[PDB]
Amino acid sequence: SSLPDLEGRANIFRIHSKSMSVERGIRWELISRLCPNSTGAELRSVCTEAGMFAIRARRKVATEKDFLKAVDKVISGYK
Amino acid sequence: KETNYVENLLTQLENELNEDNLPEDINTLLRKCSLNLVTVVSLPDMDVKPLLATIKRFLTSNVSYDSLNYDYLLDVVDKLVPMADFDDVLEVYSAEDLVKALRSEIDPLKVAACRVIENSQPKGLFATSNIIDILLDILFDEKVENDKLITAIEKALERLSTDELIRRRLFDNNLPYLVSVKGRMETVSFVRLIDFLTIEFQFISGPEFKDIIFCFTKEEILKSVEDILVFIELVNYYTKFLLEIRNQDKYWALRHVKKILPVFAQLFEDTENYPDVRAFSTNCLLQLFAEVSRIEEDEYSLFKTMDKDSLKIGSEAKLITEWLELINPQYLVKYHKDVVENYFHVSGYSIGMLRNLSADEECFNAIRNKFSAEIVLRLPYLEQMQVVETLTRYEYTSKFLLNEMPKVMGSLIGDDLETVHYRNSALRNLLDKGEEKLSVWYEPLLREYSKAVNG
Secondary structure, eight states, X not given: OOOOXXXXXXXXXXXXXXXXXXXXXXOHHHHHHTSTTOOHHHHHHXXXXXXXXXXXXXXXXXXXXXXXXXXXHXXXXXX | OOOOHHHHHHHHHHHHHHSSSOOSTHHHHHHXXXXXXXXXXXXXXXXXXXXXHHHHHHHHSOOOOSSOOHHHHHHHHHHHHHHSOHHHHHHHSOHHHHHHHHTSSOHHHHHHHHHHHHTOSSGGGTTTTTHHHHHHHHHTOTTOOOXXXXXXXXXXXXXXXXXXXXXXXXXXXXXXXXXXHHHHOOHHHHHHHHHHHHHHHHHOOTTTOOHHHHOOOHHHHHHHTSSHHHHHHHHHHHHHHTTTTTTTTXXXXXXXXXXXXXXXXXXXXXXSSOHHHHHHSXXXXXXXXXXXXXXXXXXXXXXXXXXXXXXXXXXXXXXXXHHHHHSOHHHHHHHHHHHHHHHOOOSTTTHHHHHHHTTSHHHHHHTSTTOOHHHXXXXXHHHHHHHHHHHTTSHHHHHHHHHHOHHHHHHHHOOOHHHHHHHHHHHHHHHTTOHHHHGGGHHHHHHHHHHHHTO
């Protein structure tokens, strides 16, 4: 209907990772620049995916690298 | 009804702000102002000078308030400035007042300026001044972590970039600065530049275009691979670039890019040396390759060299399906009839490739043999409806589904909600052909369409 701005996108990502086991300084502005014109739950899924890449690599704390893997899977990933 | 009410809400705010002490309710009032400003078209007949003077005063005054949530105020400013008469807005936030604001240390005041600069009328107003120059220094400074401001700067820049005067200030006056950020290549600064540039290429014209800023060297691309996030953004910049080439018939820019493209393909193939490339960027790279096999060139010269030297379509076992789902089917048929004929079959799985291979008539002819009326009815209905719907898209495919697989036509007409979407999609795409083309199929196609939409 309207989509979120660079600011809002980071805000989604930050508020969302609170309930997630995640490593310290993940550059959320940068992650948001990789999800342009991306839906609410699209970004939420990039988090679910990052969580999966962590579990996949037998990890509890999800890397920024796990989020990059997550973006390439969800955002750049054609159905 | 006659919405006077809106100006009554603005004047009462103006009063509660100019007061010696401010109330608790102020935030709920500002929220009521923002809500009532979305609704109502450009109306409240008064020059708004008092409330904008009071707002500019409130921002320059850094003053921290226990009750006041500065964001709710700026929300009003964002909604007020565009609706308001810009000539009267220039009185409060003067050309010089903005230079002052953007060079200050008050972040909320800077944002206010960016909302003013966004709503510049005429657009090239501040193109004579260094107001454009300031914004670029803020935008490309990694220390600036204000998300609301960073965006306000870009939202302002995007609006103004339609103007030739604003673009001249960027790619001439500021061109040396822009070039510095590029060679600098600090992740935050650089990625901001990528995103600034992908916006600027929408409005940039053949002469206006400066090769130096929009283009990335082989040695630049390889340097990005370290911080993989940059390489990804760069892959993306180019996939996006090679797309707004076909989507604006800007074939002039194709020379500038053509050069570095094989670099990406090289980097993709090399795994021994760039594990990060194939790990963190496989998909978006495949996307960029899909765009290269689309660009207007001498019988796919660049792409076939890219395929022979680095991509190697078909040699790559696991990738065959992806290649067949993405790469230009016109190209796929020409150079990989083998890959198209041997590896495509009609399955539930196939669908991805089926929808891409169907796009070129010549290509679909090479995969028409894989179409038994039986092989299709083997599938569950949802799969069938996706297959049928895919065939219902083009002239040659509809013509084939109608004439050659009538058993399948029967299945579509018959005797899950996703299944229904695909089916009805197919049903209508078929009825768009007409009574004649359809023949024996028109009468029931309509019957089974009314059945599906009416009730």
